[PDB]
Amino acid sequence: LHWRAAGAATVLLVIVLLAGSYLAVLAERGAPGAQLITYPRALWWSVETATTVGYGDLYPVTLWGRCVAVVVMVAGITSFGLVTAALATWFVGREQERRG
Amino acid sequence: LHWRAAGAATVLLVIVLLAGSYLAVLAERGAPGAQLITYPRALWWSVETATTVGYGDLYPVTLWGRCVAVVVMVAGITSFGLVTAALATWFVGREQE
Amino acid sequence: LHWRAAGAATVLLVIVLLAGSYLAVLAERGAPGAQLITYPRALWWSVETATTVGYGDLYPVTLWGRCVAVVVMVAGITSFGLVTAALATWFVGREQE
Amino acid sequence: LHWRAAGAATVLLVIVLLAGSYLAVLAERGAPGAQLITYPRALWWSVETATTVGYGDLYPVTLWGRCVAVVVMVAGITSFGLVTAALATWFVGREQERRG
Ligand SMILES: [Rb+]
Ligand SMILES: [Rb+]
Ligand SMILES: [Rb+]
Incomplete structure (x- = not known):
């Protein structure tokens, strides 16, 4: 039951997104060079950030x-890195399933 | 065969690309700040997106x-993360030897 | 036992960051198209680089x-790739039980 | 020695870089919106591409x-994904050196 861990990440990440989304908007909004002004924008950003695609059309400028x-990134990096783990640990499940 | 899974991803991803490519063009095309206007552009984008290189010369502006x-990204992230899995599960194949 | 390796990376990376941060500022600062002028900026960059998010609001222009x-990147790529390893090697820990 | 595989990637990638570097310059150079004009630039790009950091200060415009x-990217993605594999397969080396 390591896939029970997968779904976990999934959730967490989504939370971290909404969390980070709603969190970051208010941390930026109203400052100079703010682009993360509206919540809908920030939302996108989180996605763009947690997947590290970083198109760079949106980013933070406030300390x-x-x-x-950072939180958002590591979250995603981690979450996916996790799912990469489950995919693999599963392959060694049918690799020892045949062997013994 | 867990590599039978590898090829799977490969395919899927390519589909998701063409899928996303052709799909996204029509979802953007004709809107404001539309960048993903032509299908050939979108195509590129999918690549640039599924590999998360995100040069950012092209991206979506429509909800x-x-x-x-998102689909494209996770697809690629997943697909590669998968192939990373096969590479490894294989190493433990000659480690249990 | 192998998580002792995880924390290692964590550290190293953070060092490489500060290292790279403080290191790169002085390698760029004062040159043309210099973006990595202040240390606080460079700091950010390292993060943005080691996570490969590459928003591209900051980057090097000096050879x-x-x-x-490169060092910063590979560092992060490596460090995380490592933690991905521990997460997995652990799953095969409760798979062989 | 699956690490014999690691060094392999390392090499290959570096080749693919120089390969892609020198290769891509000539595929772009002299076209419209070309930014990958000089070889030294392209070189950088390969790095920036194979690590997928994609700052986006340089990219291709020619079909x-x-x-x-694509080749460069997958190369790097693959190469690192590989090294992530060796790191792990090694951990299960001292996990079965404790587990029995
Ligand atoms: Rb990336
Ligand atoms: Rb970018
Ligand atoms: Rb990126």
């Missing part, structure tokens, strides 16, 4: 917003 | 195009 | 700054 | 240059 970032 | 995105 | 980069 | 890309 705080940049933290909300 | 929809951004979904086509 | 040197670009090395500081 | 060809974009292929040189």
